[PDB]
């Protein structure tokens, strides 16, 4: 380092390497559909199940 040359003297370099990037590894993941339940609110995914039979039982009772 050029400031470290100003109090002591360097010899020839034995190794010349650079700055690498350390980061922690996420170690992968699995595919999932609970992840797909998330961009909508999770109560609405159960709210889909509600009015389907609201149409269905009304269609069942007026078969007359």
């Amino acid at each position: 380092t050029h400031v470290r040359e100003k109090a002591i003297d360097f010899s020839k370099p034995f190794m010349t390497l650079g700055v690498s990037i350390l980061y922690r590894k996420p170690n992968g993941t699995n595919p999932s559909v609970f992840s797909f339940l998330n961009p909508l609110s999770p109560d609405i995914w159960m709210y889909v199940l509600l009015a389907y039979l609201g149409v269905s039982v009304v269609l069942f009772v007026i078969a007359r």
Binding site: L40, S41, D43, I44, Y47, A51, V58
Partner: peptide, 22 residues
């Protein structure tokens, strides 16, 4: 509730298709 949940606008046709009396 995030965007919706209104079952109130939807219930108009439920009372509409009951008409069987002449």
């Amino acid at each position: 509730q995030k965007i919706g949940g209104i079952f109130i606008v939807l219930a108009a046709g439920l009372v509409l298709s009951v008409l069987v009396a002449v």
